[PDB]
Amino acid sequence: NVAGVTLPVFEHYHEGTDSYELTGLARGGEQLAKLKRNYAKAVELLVELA
Amino acid sequence: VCLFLNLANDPTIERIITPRLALTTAEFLAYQCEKHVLVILTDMSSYAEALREVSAAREEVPGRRGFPGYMYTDLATIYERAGRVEGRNGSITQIPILTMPNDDITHPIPDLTGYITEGQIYVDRQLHNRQIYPPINVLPSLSRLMKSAIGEGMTRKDHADVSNQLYACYAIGKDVQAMKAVVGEEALTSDDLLYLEFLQKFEKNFITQGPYENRTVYETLDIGWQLLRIFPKEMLKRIPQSTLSEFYP
């Protein structure tokens, strides 16, 4: 409530379910962890813009 | 002190006669004898009522609001008995009081009085309801001869600057209270808090005097400086730098 009227905003609430071990496709675990991190940053930025 | 009283139940002719008697004794005591005299008149609206009475007795046709037209020149006669005169070291100064009917500035009495006076001091109902013993509202008030009444040879050099700054920042403070009325306290800046606190302390101290506190002019200027020191140095836009260096620290 920044003024007389109330504005809608959102928060990146990390619910925290465990990720998925994908150890089948030659097991590039480094690549998967890096991808997860990058997309997490993307999601946070997108939530902020939203 | 030379005092005159005229109760309400007295003859009206006594009422019309009295102020001229007061003015003549003032003139004698001030000019024929070297004195400086402060004349105070109370509630000239009753003098106007007596003027209406004598007009009705003579059977002259009333005009605006039941007042004779020549009352303007009559009031001029009761005025213009002031100012200094060459060849004399004395002075005379009139400070009358009026009863405004229903807060109407366009009523003939105050309007004409303003046409033949050099300023006015207001009294506001809200301040009286706020239990501030001097209810003076200094915003609409104005004195036309400030520039010569004060100065370095006078009370002090910094007086005019202090007065102007005080007036301007009070205006801004009233505006900031209006701002707070809607925007909320959390949406304010530090500057707005400074203005509000300054305003509050100002009516607390500068305006309130007490029924017997005889403050000297230097004391009033000191109080003003103390209140000014609340704001930081840079916001004193109306203050020349030299005075700020001399007095602010």
Curated annotation (Swiss-Prot), chain A:
Belongs to the V-ATPase D subunit family. The gene is Atp6v1d. It comes from the Eukaryota. It is found in: Membrane; Cytoplasmic vesicle, Clathrin-coated vesicle membrane; Cytoplasm, Cytoskeleton, Microtubule organizing center, Centrosome; Cell projection, Cilium. This is V-type proton ATPase subunit D. V-ATPase is a heteromultimeric enzyme made up of two complexes: the ATP-hydrolytic V1 complex and the proton translocation V0 complex. The V1 complex consists of three catalytic AB heterodimers that form a heterohexamer, three peripheral stalks each consisting of EG heterodimers, one central rotor including subunits D and F, and the regulatory subunits C and H. The proton translocation complex V0 consists of the proton transport subunit a, a ring of proteolipid subunits c9c'', rotary subunit d, subunits e and f, and the accessory subunits ATP6AP1/Ac45 and ATP6AP2/PRR. Interacts with SNX10. Subunit of the V1 complex of vacuolar(H+)-ATPase (V-ATPase), a multisubunit enzyme composed of a peripheral complex (V1) that hydrolyzes ATP and a membrane integral complex (V0) that translocates protons. V-ATPase is responsible for acidifying and maintaining the pH of intracellular compartments and in some cell types, is targeted to the plasma membrane, where it is responsible for acidifying the extracellular environment. May play a role in cilium biogenesis through regulation of the transport and the localization of proteins to the cilium. It comes from Mus musculus (Mouse).
UniProtKB/Swiss-Prot annotation, chain B:
Signal peptide: none annotated. Belongs to the ATPase alpha/beta chains family. ATP binds at residue 144. Kidney; found in early distal nephron, encompassing thick ascending limbs and distal convoluted tubules and in the alpha-intercalated cells of the cortical collecting ducts (at protein level). Expressed in epididymal clear cells (at protein level). Mainly expressed in the organ of Corti and spiral ganglion neurons, in both the early postnatal cochlea (P2) and the adult cochlea (P30). It comes from the Eukaryota. Disruption phenotype: Morpholino knockdown in the whole cochlea, especially in hair cells and spiral ganglion neurons causes a dose-dependent hearing loss. V-ATPase is a heteromultimeric enzyme made up of two complexes: the ATP-hydrolytic V1 complex and the proton translocation V0 complex. The V1 complex consists of three catalytic AB heterodimers that form a heterohexamer, three peripheral stalks each consisting of EG heterodimers, one central rotor including subunits D and F, and the regulatory subunits C and H. The proton translocation complex V0 consists of the proton transport subunit a, a ring of proteolipid subunits c9c'', rotary subunit d, subunits e and f, and the accessory subunits ATP6AP1/Ac45 and ATP6AP2/PRR. It comes from Mus musculus (Mouse). Non-catalytic subunit of the V1 complex of vacuolar(H+)-ATPase (V-ATPase), a multisubunit enzyme composed of a peripheral complex (V1) that hydrolyzes ATP and a membrane integral complex (V0) that translocates protons. V-ATPase is responsible for acidifying and maintaining the pH of intracellular compartments and in some cell types, is targeted to the plasma membrane, where it is responsible for acidifying the extracellular environment. The gene is Atp6v1b2. This is V-type proton ATPase subunit B, brain isoform. The lineage of its organism: Eukaryota, Metazoa, Chordata, Craniata, Vertebrata. It is found in: Apical cell membrane; Melanosome; Cytoplasm; Cytoplasmic vesicle, Secretory vesicle, Synaptic vesicle membrane. Disulfide bonds: none annotated.
